Design an enzyme around this catalytic site. Structure first.
Site, PDB file in Angstrom:
ATOM      1  N   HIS A  41     -30.235  24.967  32.557  1.00  0.00           N
ATOM      2  CA  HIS A  41     -31.646  24.598  32.618  1.00  0.00           C
ATOM      3  C   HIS A  41     -31.889  23.345  33.452  1.00  0.00           C
ATOM      4  CE1 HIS A  41     -30.554  22.111  28.997  1.00  0.00           C
ATOM      5  NE2 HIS A  41     -31.376  21.266  29.589  1.00  0.00           N
ATOM      6  N   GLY A 143     -32.070  13.251  28.688  1.00  0.00           N
ATOM      7  CA  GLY A 143     -31.094  13.098  29.744  1.00  0.00           C
ATOM      8  C   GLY A 143     -29.652  13.250  29.312  1.00  0.00           C
ATOM      9  N   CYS A 145     -28.314  15.938  28.120  1.00  0.00           N
ATOM     10  CA  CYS A 145     -27.829  17.301  28.277  1.00  0.00           C
ATOM     11  C   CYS A 145     -26.675  17.341  29.269  1.00  0.00           C
ATOM     12  CB  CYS A 145     -28.964  18.216  28.720  1.00  0.00           C
ATOM     13  SG  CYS A 145     -30.247  18.321  27.465  1.00  0.00           S
TER      14      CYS A 145
HETATM   15 NA    NA Z   1     -31.895  19.191  29.054  1.00  0.00          NA
END
Ligand code: NA
Ligand code: NA
EC number: 3.4.19.12
Lengths: 305, 305
Positions: A41, A143, A145
């Site tokens: 994503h 942030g 991820c």
């Molecule tokens: Na993310």
């Protein structure tokens, strides 16, 4: 002596964290050999996440639309592919700091260390357990991820988790390094039921053994129980049923302490039924379930990596 | 979201851990530039530790009696000196992995990350607080002496602790990197009183602010208090007296949450007087005092290194 929730040394993983940017979205990637792994994503806008068609969105992207930065080292993306929920970016340089590693899909109840990262830079390290309902209770800000969970055995890093999303309930969900989510979750911004969580019974028992080794013995009683009788109590207090496999794993701890597993189960039963009466165990007023039997043996023997 | 007891990434420190051997004693050393730092009782036998004359014992030692191994890299000791309770071994090669660093003597109540090591090899990392009585509650097995505590700010490692001994009560004592013990302790195997410990009040308050930021609000009441009135309660429950300096440090957290510090003190007073009634705060059934205000701000903003 002493017992602490202890994470693995993070050095081998720090050298693999990179920053991945696609358009206006930046997150963390994992650079191993000449491949960078990151959540898919990264190709989404804020509006895309409501109902993303990842195949269609990835079609709009080319190799040069992905910017990969390792501190200040520019990585040249020469190929890209989507594997489940992860993006695999082929870069023209192999990471010189790549450790020996494996990709592992861990079981619920097992533990790992999380290296929380932001913009490709490590910020902290902590130990987690994969809950029975396949969530983790971490610390993941915007942030984070792409941050990864891992275990280390001697010189080998076993990567088991990549962070993808925070559920509306505040708990966290992610995938293995093949991009397959743990649990029923998907990478879109919707309400997602996690399902009933339970307490990891074999981990609580291992922690009670750690307590006895370190001198906390007040909870030891003169009672015993049976596996079936204990499991009736476990079901009432939303504990995982104990199996003979769990009894077997606890074998070394029972041998060292001289306390049979079913005797320790009877101690746990009394703690569940009567509480702690305002006392503590290893500095905790609750029953701790984030130490596996292997974790306890490691910290009571002093194994290195 | 989420809040975890989080250690600094340990990579910069892992590259500085070496194994120091003198006779039959082995422990950990810290290799910075061309100097190795280690606890001076590496020169002691098991019997020596009862009443060691360190000056006399060090006279028996020469440069070649110290064996320093960095994984497999042999370090050639070309000089040795005793600074307080640490041994400084000059080696003929500067550590190529030396980070930017400072030596710091921290204050009671401040926190740091410990890299537990055995035989010069890192085993785990965890966060600690220096107790008001200058002990730490760590996890240190036999051979962990020489393990260091540290903080990281951007790219700079501030070393603040080197582990030296486990007191008969199971708590741990050590020095700064100049070899000066924290607290009244000495490096000999004797009974040593640690003195009354207290709870770090400003840290508990910062953790309550972290709880509100993350959604735990049940402990917020409609009461307020004064600094003097609160300190009467603090003294009764063995809490550190709160000063205006502590109120000032909590300023940013009070601004973000809109809860004045004295209002949060009144919440804490009610928790001290009435307990938690079997509820939890950030997954804990006890009042946690191992997060400084700076620790909370770091984890609620996401600073990196
Ligand atoms: Na993310
Ligand atoms: Na020692």
């Amino acid at each position: 002596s002493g017992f602490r929730k202890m994470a693995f040394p993070s050095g081998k993983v720090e050298g693999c964290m990179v920053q991945v940017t696609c358009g206006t979205t930046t997150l963390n990637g994992l650079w191993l050999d000449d491949v960078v792994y990151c959540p898919r994503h990264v190709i989404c806008t804020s509006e895309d996440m409501l109902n993303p068609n990842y195949e269609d969105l990835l079609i709009r992207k080319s190799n040069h639309n992905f910017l990969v930065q390792a501190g200040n080292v520019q990585l040249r993306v020469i190929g890209h592919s989507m594997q489940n929920c992860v993006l695999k970016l082929k870069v023209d340089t192999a990471n010189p700091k790549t450790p020996k590693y494996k990709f592992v899909r861990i079981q619920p109840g097992q533990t790992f260390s999380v290296l929380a990262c932001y913009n490709g830079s490590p910020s902290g390290v902590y130990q987690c357990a994969m809950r029975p309902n396949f969530t983790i209770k971490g610390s993941f800000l915007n942030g984070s991820c792409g941050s990864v969970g891992f275990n280390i055995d001697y010189d080998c890093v076993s990567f088991c988790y990549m962070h993808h999303m925070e559920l509306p309930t505040g708990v966290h969900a992610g995938t293995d390094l093949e991009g397959n989510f743990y649990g029923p979750f998907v990478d879109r911004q919707t309400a997602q039921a996690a399902g009933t969580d339970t307490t990891i019974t074999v981990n609580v028992l291992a922690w009670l053994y750690a307590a006895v080794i370190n001198g906390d013995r007040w909870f030891l009683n003169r009672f015993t129980t049976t596996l079936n009788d204990f499991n009736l109590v476990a079901m009432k207090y939303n504990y995982e049923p104990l199996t003979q496999d769990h009894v077997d794993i606890l074998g070394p701890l029972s041998a060292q302490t001289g306390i049979a597993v079913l005797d320790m189960c009877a101690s746990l039963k009394e703690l569940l039924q009567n509480g702690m009466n305002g006392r503590t165990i290893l500095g905790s007023a609750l029953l701790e379930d984030e130490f596996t039997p292997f974790d306890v043996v490691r910290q009571c023997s002093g194994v290195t990596f």
